[PDB]
Structures are given as structure tokens and as C-alpha cells.
Design a binder for this molecule. Structure first.
Ligand code: UDX
Ligand code: UDX
Ligand code: UDX
Ligand code: UDX
Ligand code: UDX
Lengths: 459, 165, 457
């Protein structure tokens, strides 16, 4: 007795669902993969020459498969009805009111997907929740399925967290450090788990596939994300200590990271981490711990967010202090709005928070990013936006007549700008605030040109 | 300790700080020449004395933090029916996290870790960095909680009387 | 299954009277009460019982040596018993987690191990106390881990509702009997066997059966409700003093509501006894351990109010005696925690005496039943200088500045207050902490006393 997945439906065509299913289709030519979404313009973009997200290599993966065994559709109902495997990869926004307001994930879209699946399903199907931050997701799906049975309907629920990082999604999906699958410790659960393993074994060695139960799967993802965020907050805390004592956080990070028990990754100090994963993940971990009467664990992990918030505030107040605490009507260029390089995603970007701190001081911001759409920047910063915010088409326009240049995202193009040209047209003193350490090694040239260079973790 | 000889014979790195003066660099180079009898040159890092000491204080604290972090997850595992050794395996297979120093325990000891974090916290308070101080203090508070929770599990299992047992 | 031999481990205020009544009502059952305390056992076998309970002497002497026995041979009484009661004391922990609050189960656990060591075959083991705190569970824990072939021990909970001073009346006509046992065939068979004992004199409709935890929780809660009524009326007594009302009149108006009831509304210097304070302390501690802090601080108020009532009475005494009691003689009438017992555990008289001693008062303490050595122990060098224990109440009042009534012994209402006033120092004060002199106020004022009482200005 086993189950072979021949048709996959993925509900959610976002940063998780789109790339993941495109790689599955690419690696499994005999499996039909249909990605569905309520958002019609997003589906139309997936079917166009201009994809709705920017991921290096994604266009090539999509175009090698689309229309052969990879499909993007708004017909959610028919995709479910015919699927052997249904992924749920939707967003779980933070509650904006009620218990856990601003902290706890809202499961309403997961629950609506589960209800929609029952409505449109007959026979046997595997339903797998796949997200970067699963918060009681498998349990809520099972609760709906347990309460809404039909004769001969047999739905299995798996957890399959997604470990990809945006901007490296395709490389991460093709060579994952591990694949994590959680399922019930019953004959039915193990048959479903094996079926999903067989999909991944088309390109992932078996020794890199971990199998467990659904809760251990979700807790492992929640903890792993928090460990990553903690490394960043830890090295950022050291960056403040370096600034206060004359050390350089990049040199300290190198010495730390050469301990093979620590490792040398995720030790790059920055204005602060962003993205839809880390802050949401730690907030939900803290909230969960409070609900379980584990306040010591809750306040332990809360420090990861408190440190990130302090790192952002400290960076902004250095900018304001350098401008002698009045920035009313001063032009300031913001270079980089995405939460990291090589994506157009801005969710929880530090650039949003730095911009708002400067807007509260009356700065006239000119914002340039090579990939973030103009309209997204307007939405993220929302009358005050109308008065203070300009979206520049190129970085020289943003810097023309500026008092300060603030680098918030580590796009490689920023280290190659014509900084002699930028200096000529800035007001003096002309400041560069490197919130990403991308201008390291240009410091002598920039000082010779005449800039005041300030960067995180060095004074 | 316990692996001193192997650690001394094959260190991950040697860290030497000295003044950024001609005399300081002559001294640094003399000490480098000792270690180069058995340590490859690419594993010897040289810096100034403060950066050297700060790097050690921070590196020790990162190690202590990994333990308190996995110990905090161990309490969450006990409360929810998961197994911290399995969760640790899943975490440690991320090559950006690494798989070392994720062994949950009654709590870390030794003459290094607690003293190191306490002095780091004290230094931060003296420099008017209270946010950094309370960030690192959690490493100690979690370790103290881990020990207390273990003892009270023992006492609870003995039904809260241990007199003459 | 018919219970024919009963062993009770613990010959105290609970074990002694309960088994004596069982023996009285069940002539076909051999009842053996055992204890490690040899002098206590010898007293139970003597013409002078080790505790004072009205009517107990008559009950014991009609049974002792016929089907009621008191012995130090714990091992053989267990070995032969069909049913073993455990009625031992669970003192509050004096160190460690829950110090001063949580009950120490070490004696319950030692009894459970001793029962396993001396048992074969089938026995029912029943924990009986006024404050059971996880007692049945800890006994089961021991039995479950120490099995023998053909050994079959059943664990029941059977909390004791009697109040001291009315033990015999309460045991013979209980408002209800509460038995907890497992919801298994074996548990229900054991429950029914214990029911069959009580049905010799208790109507079946007054016997409640449930599981062991519900039984213990019900007792913990019931004790706390009773204590709360006392603290509630004592809190109103302070408001009465502050506003010119009389708490006895207010209590009457309150108690005529049949939804409130008219019992346990007698304001006092404060409740005492080994039950109420221990019960609330353990309830609060349990709630904190279950992450129920709102419930914990709700019940804590019962104790805080009781402590406040004692402090307020004591400072009223000092205020009335011109803000100073140094070198003043004060008679303390009543040391037991309530009338008709010699028991002093948590008696308000202890606390009142200590407050006055710390202010330099010379106490002359009289109680008709509390032994002299017990008073010395309860108040413990300061005792040597300041405390005298009198043989009669007129000697305690001889040359006194004030008389403080702490226990509502009926004999206090009938004292020769004419004679008492003559040899007291003047002005002569009476501090009635029990409302026992109500209605004598006119006669006492005419004699010349200054009377101050709880719940009236
Ligand atoms: O009921 C729904 C809800 C949502 N959706 C779709 O699901 C898609 C989700 O895509 P997003 O780009 O917003 O989100 P991601 O793919 O990046 O998910 C990631 O970030 C959001 C977090 O809540 C998740 O934990 C994480 O996996 C959207 O396009 C949305 O239209 C549905 O089709 N149906
Ligand atoms: O050393 C670092 C690394 C990362 N960062 C910042 O941390 C934030 C997160 O960066 P990541 O590369 O982890 O990107 P992501 O948020 O897309 O992925 C993260 O969450 C989803 C998980 O599945 C991934 O495993 C995890 O890396 C970015 O703002 C980044 O700039 C640092 O500031 N310093
Ligand atoms: O995964 C782990 C690792 C370690 N530990 C505990 O952490 C404590 C420290 O153990 P270590 O192996 O680090 O031993 P040490 O304290 O001697 O060395 C530590 O401090 C001195 C520094 O120079 C070393 O680099 C550092 O490892 C021990 O109590 C150990 O049992 C864990 O509980 N879990
Ligand atoms: O292991 C023991 C412990 C105690 N005992 C005896 O058990 C007897 C208990 O008698 P006590 O007068 O002290 O106590 P009580 O009968 O009044 O119990 C009551 O008050 C004490 C509280 O802890 C109980 O909850 C309550 O039922 C003592 O005589 C003691 O010597 C044993 O025989 N064996
Ligand atoms: O109205 C009252 C009633 C009682 N009290 C005081 O409250 C204290 C307790 O008195 P009780 O009559 O309840 O006597 P006990 O403490 O022996 O019995 C109590 O605990 C044991 C349980 O089994 C009983 O059911 C419970 O009444 C005494 O100090 C008494 O004087 C008042 O102050 N006012």
C-alpha cells in the first residue's frame, strides 16, 4: 500500500509557492504542477515574460517548464479536485487587533484553504502546509478536516517547511541543506510522508531528507529561524560595542567566525534584519511561550527583536546627530529599499523604519532601489509621504543636492557608483552612512574625495 | 578543557593583538614565529590588543548563547511533546547555523562562560550600552533557569518532600 | 466484600474519635487504632484520654477492649486489617520549595511504604484527614511502584468533616460522608465496602461518592468557604467599629437571607485550628503551581483578613490601656482555639499573647482544658519573665489591669464579675474578643468595668 503523487496543486503563488513549485516541476518532468492564487494579476504575471517577483534564475526555471508540466491558474477549484498533493503556501499576517495583536499570526487564510479543500475534494489526497513560519498550521488544517468528513474522503496532513532565502531561492531549492517533512506516526501518515519524500528524491539525496511528526517539524522551523535571527542581533550588539570602543565589527566577526563550533555565516552586521520571516517568527515564538506559561523562554527570545529595534534606532539617530539634530527640509538619499539584495521584496525592510525616523524629523527623502516598484515604496511609507518622499529613477538624482547618502540595502551596484560625481553635487559636509558595510575598502578614496563616512560597527 | 591537547595542537585560529607601531609589530611577529612551528600561517590572526580581547569576550559569549538557546528550546520541547535532540538535529543541518554546541543540558559551567558574559554585561553598562547589556544577560538568566527547572522537576517527581531521601 | 477488621494509623484528633465512633456503631468490626506515640497510646487506654472532646470518654469506654483497641503494634494491625485508615499529620514544610505554605507529605508516604511492607492479599487503604493535599495520589504512587504477587491494595479518599469540640455529635450525625475512589470495577467495589461501614449509622442519601481528586478538592474548597465566612464577618466587624454599628446586629440581618444562611457569622479575634489556615495556604500554593494566580490571590485574602483582625484587636487593647502595657498585668481567659477542646493549634490566643508580650505585658493565662506545658511551648526567656499560668480564672484576674477573653468558654459568661472587679486595678477593662459577654454589658458597666468588644465602637 502506497501513494504516488502525479499531480500537484499549490495554493499560493508567492515567494514560497511560485519558486518552490517551479523547481519541483523542473526536477520532476512526469509530475503535473499547477500553482493557483486568488490574485489574478499575480497569476497573469507568472504566465508573462515579466514574473511578479524578482529572483535570480527564476525566469529560466519557469520558462523551461511552463506549459509543459508547470501551470499558473486562477481556477483554484479544479486544481484541487484533480490534485494528488495540495500544498498550502499562503500568507499568515499578524493580527492587528484582539488577543496577541501585533504579535500572533492570523490563521484565517490557512483555515479558509482547508475548508475550500474539503469542499472540492473526493477520495484520497495529501495536503501539505509549506511556509517559512508555520504557526500551528498543521493542527488547524487537521481540525477542519477532522470535523468535515465525507464518505470516501481521506485527507492526510503533512508539514513541509520551506528553508529557502529570498534572492537565492533557486540555488537553495535545488541544493537544500535539508528537507523537513512532518507527518502522523500512523500507517496513513507514514504512507503520505513516503509519497512526499519520493517527490524530493528526484533531486535531493535521501540522507538530506528528515522525517518527523508535524509539530516537531513546525517547532524545528520556528527555532531554526530564531537561531538565524539571533546570530544577526548578536553581531549587531557587538557592532555597538565596537563603535563605543574603537574596534571594527568586521574584524571581530572574522575572529569569532573562525571558531568552527560557531561557523562564519550570518555574522554580517547591518542596520537590522528585515523580511517576512524573522521578526514574525520570533514574535510568534515569544507569544507561544507566553501561552505555555514559559515566560523565561519568552523574554529570552524577545531580546532578538529588541536588539534589532535598537540597532535601527541607533543608526537613525547617528544620521540625525551628524546633521546636528535638525533635518527639516534637508534632502537625504536613501539607497536601497528591499530588505536584502537581489529581491524586490520590502516586507519589514529596515529601509522602511529608517525612512520613517527621518520623515519624523522632516527630511526630504529621495529613494532609489533597482528592483522595488515605485508604488510599493509609496505604500510602505504611508500626506507626510506627499510632502517628504520622492522616488528617484537613478541614484545620482537621489544624491543631487543631498546632505547625506544612506545605504540600507547591500545591492552590489552601490559600490560601483561614481562617488566623485556624487560629491560634486552634494551639499557639504556630505555624509555617507553605510548601513551594510558595502563600501569597505573604498574608505580612503571616499575620504580623499571629501566625504564624511560613517558605517555600522566602526568609528 | 578535556580536549586541551588536541585543541592546542590544531587550533581553529591563533589570535595575537599588539600595538600598531613598529615595536608592536616586531613583537607580534616574534610570537607568530613561535606558533608557526606547528600552526599554518593562514590560521594566525593579528590585530591590536583591544580588538583581540573583545573578540575573545564576544566569541565565548556566542558559544554560551548557543547552549542557552538550545536549552530554552528544550523547555519548549518538554511542554509540547517534542524531543530537543531531534529538533537540534534539524536546526544544526543548516550550514549557516552549524551542528556544534547544540547539546541541551542541565546547564553550562566552567570558569569561562558565566564570568565572560557577566563581564561583558558589566562592560556594556559602564559604556552606557544598557540595550547590549540586557541582551547578553539573557544568556545567564536562561542558564540559571535551566538549572532551577531541572532541580524542581526532580523535587516534583519526589512529590515535593526530599527530607532524608 | 465485608470489612471486618479496621486499622487506623494515627491516633489524633481525627483518628481517635472517628474510629471510636466506628467501633461504637459497628460491633461486628474490630477497630485497632495505632500510633508511634507510645504515651498517646497509653493515654487512650487510660481513664484520662489524651484529648478533650465532650462525650468521647463515654464512647471509648463502651467499646475499648471489646471491639476498639489502641496499640503501638503498627505492623500487626496492618497485616490483619481489611481496611487501613491513614490519619496522620502533614505539617507545613519548614524549608525548600513551598516553605511555610505547602504541606509535607513525608508521613503519608512513610505510612504507605509501611503498609506495603506489612501487607499481603486484598486491603482497602483510605486517607482520612481534614486537609488532604494530594494525599491519595502519593499513596497510589507508592503502591503502583511496589507491587507483589496477589497483593491488591485499593486507595480511597474519605475526608473528615468533624469540628473539634463537637466531634462525637458530628461523627454520629454528619451532614454528609464523602468517599472518593477510582472509576474502575475494583475502585467501585472498595468504595461500596466503605459505604457499607458508614451505612451502619448514616443514611445512604447522605453518602456522596466520587473520584479521589474530586473528593480532596471538595474538602479543600469547603474548608475555605467556611473560613471565608468568618473573615467576611470579621471585615464587617471593623467597619462596624468605625461607623457606630454593631456587628452582631448586622450579622443577624445578613443571616436571615436563606441564600446566605445564619451559621458561621460570629465575629471573633480570629479563626484558629489546624484546618483553616493550613487549608487556605495549600489552596493558594496549589493555584500558583497550576498557573492560576487570580484564584490564588482571591483566597489569600481570607488569611490576610484573619491576620489583620488579630492585629487590630491587639492594638485596640494597647490603645485602650493608654498606649502602654509595659509592666501592666493582663489576664488572658481562653487559650484553646475554640471552646470545648484543649487544642491550641493556630489559636488566636497565641498571637494576641505574643503581641502583648512584645509590648512588655505580664500575662496571667487561664484555660480550663489546655495543659500548662502546651501554653509555654506555644508562646516560646520572654516566657519566664512575662507569662504566668493560673489554676483558676479569679487568680488570673487578681490585680490585673485588663481581662482579655480570647476563647468562648461558656464558664466565662458565668464568672463572679462582682468579685473580679473588686480586686482588679482601676479603671478595670474587659476586652471581649468573642462577644461572649453580650447582654451583660449593662450589669458590667454598672459594676464599673470598661467593656470593649469586637464589632462595636
Ligand atoms: O486564502 C488565500 C490567502 C493567500 N493567497 C495567496 O497566497 C500568496 C502568498 O504569497 P506571499 O508573497 O504574500 O507570501 P509568501 O509566499 O512569501 O509566504 C511567506 O511570507 C508570508 C508568511 O505568512 C509565510 O509564513 C511565508 O511562507 C499570495 O499571492 C496570496 O494571494 C491565496 O491564494 N489564498
Ligand atoms: O549576516 C546577515 C545575514 C542576513 N542579514 C539580514 O537578515 C534578513 C534575512 O535575510 P535572509 O538571507 O535570511 O533572507 P530570508 O528572510 O529570505 O530567509 C530567512 O527566512 C526564511 C527562511 O526559510 C530562511 O532559511 C532564512 O534565511 C535580511 O534583512 C538580511 O539582509 C543580516 O543583516 N546579516
Ligand atoms: O553543546 C554543549 C556544549 C557545551 N556544554 C557545556 O558548556 C560548558 C563549557 O564547555 P566547553 O566544551 O566549551 O569547555 P570550556 O568551558 O573549558 O571551554 C570554553 O571556554 C573556554 C574557551 O577558551 C573555549 O573555547 C570554550 O569552548 C560545559 O559545562 C559543557 O558541558 C553544553 O551544555 N552543551
Ligand atoms: O508517620 C506517622 C505520623 C504521625 N503519626 C501519628 O498521627 C497522629 C496525628 O494526630 P494529630 O493530633 O497530630 O493530628 P490530627 O489527627 O488532628 O490531624 C489533623 O491535623 C493535622 C493535619 O495535618 C491533618 O490534615 C488533620 O487531619 C499523631 O499522634 C502522630 O503521632 C503516626 O502514627 N505515624
Ligand atoms: O462563626 C464562627 C465560627 C468559627 N469561628 C472560629 O473558627 C475556628 C474554626 O472553628 P470550627 O468550628 O470550624 O472548628 P474546626 O477547626 O475544628 O473545624 C473546621 O476544620 C475541620 C473541618 O473538618 C470542619 O468541618 C471545620 O469546621 C475556631 O477558631 C472558631 O472559634 C469563628 O471565629 N466564628
Amino acid at each position: 500500500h502506497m501513494f504516488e503523487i502525479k499531480k500537484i496543486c499549490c495554493i499560493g503563488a508567492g515567494y514560497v509557492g511560485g519558486p518552490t513549485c517551479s523547481v519541483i516541476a523542473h526536477m520532476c518532468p512526469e509530475i503535473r504542477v499547477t500553482v493557483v492564487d486568488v490574485n489574478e494579476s499575480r497569476i497573469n504575471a507568472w504566465n508573462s515574460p515579466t514574473l511578479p517577483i524578482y529572483e535570480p534564475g527564476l525566469k529560466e526555471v519557469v520558462e523551461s517548464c511552463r506549459g509543459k508540466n508547470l501551470f499558473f491558474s486562477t481556477n483554484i477549484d479544479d486544481a484541487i479536485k484533480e490534485a494528488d498533493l495540495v500544498f498550502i503556501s499562503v500568507n499568515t499576517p499578524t493580527k492587528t487587533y484582539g488577543m496577541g495583536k501585533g504579535r500572533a499570526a492570523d490563521l484565517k487564510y490557512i483555515e479558509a484553504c482547508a475548508r475550500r479543500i474539503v469542499q472540492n475534494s473526493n477520495g484520497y489526497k495529501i495536503v501539505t502546509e509549506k511556509s517559512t513560519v508555520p504557526v500551528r498550521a498543521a493542527e488547524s488544517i487537521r481540525r477542519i478536516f477532522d470535523a468535515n468528513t465525507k464518505p470516501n474522503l481521506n485527507l492526510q496532513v503533512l508539514s513541509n517547511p520551506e528553508f529557502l532565502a529570498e534572492g537565492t531561492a533557486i540555488k537553495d531549492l535545488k541544493n537544500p541543506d535539508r528537507v523537513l517533512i512532518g507527518g502522523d506516526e500512523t500507517p496513513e501518515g507514514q504512507r503520505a510522508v513516503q509519497a512526499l519524500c519520493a517527490v524530493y528524491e528526484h533531486w535531493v539525496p535521501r540522507e538530506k531528507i528528515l522525517t518527523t511528526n508535524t509539530w516537531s517539524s513546525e517547532l524545528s522551523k520556528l527555532a531554526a529561524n530564531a537561531f538565524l535571527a539571533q546570530r544577526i542581533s548578536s553581531i549587531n550588539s557587538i557592532s555597538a560595542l565596537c563603535e563605543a570602543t574603537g574596534a571594527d565589527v568586521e574584524e571581530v566577526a572574522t575572529a569569532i567566525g573562525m571558531d568552527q563550533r560557531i561557523g562564519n555565516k550570518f555574522l554580517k552586521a547591518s542596520v537590522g534584519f528585515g523580511g517576512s520571516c524573522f521578526q514574525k517568527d520570533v514574535l510568534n515564538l515569544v507569544y507561544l511561550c507566553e501561552a505555555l506559561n514559559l515566560p523565561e523562554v519568552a523574554r529570552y527570545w524577545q531580546q532578538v527583536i529588541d536588539m534589532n529595534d535598537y540597532q535601527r534606532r541607533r543608526f537613525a539617530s547617528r544620521i540625525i546627530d551628524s546633521l546636528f539634530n535638525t533635518v527639516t527640509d534637508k534632502k537625504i538619499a536613501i539607497l536601497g529599499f528591499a530588505f536584502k539584495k537581489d529581491t524586490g521584496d520590502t516586507r519589514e525592510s529596515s529601509s522602511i523604519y529608517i525612512s520613517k525616523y527621518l520623515m519624523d524629523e522632516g527630511a526630504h527623502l529621495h529613494i532609489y532601489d533597482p528592483k522595488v516598484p515605485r508604488e510599493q515604496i509609496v505604500v510602505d511609507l504611508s500626506d507626510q509621504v506627499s510632502r517628504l518622499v520622492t522616488i528617484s529613477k537613478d541614484p545620482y538624482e537621489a544624491c543631487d543636492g543631498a546632505h547625506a547618502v544612506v545605504i540600507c540595502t547591500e545591492w552590489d551596484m552601490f559600490k560601483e557608483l561614481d562617488y566623485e560625481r556624487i560629491h560634486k553635487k552634494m551639499l557639504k559636509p556630505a555624509f555617507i552612512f553605510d548601513g551594510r558595510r558595502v563600501l569597505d575598502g573604498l574608505h580612503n578614496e571616499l575620504q580623499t574625495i571629501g566625504f564624511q563616512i560613517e558605517t555600522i560597527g566602526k568609528k
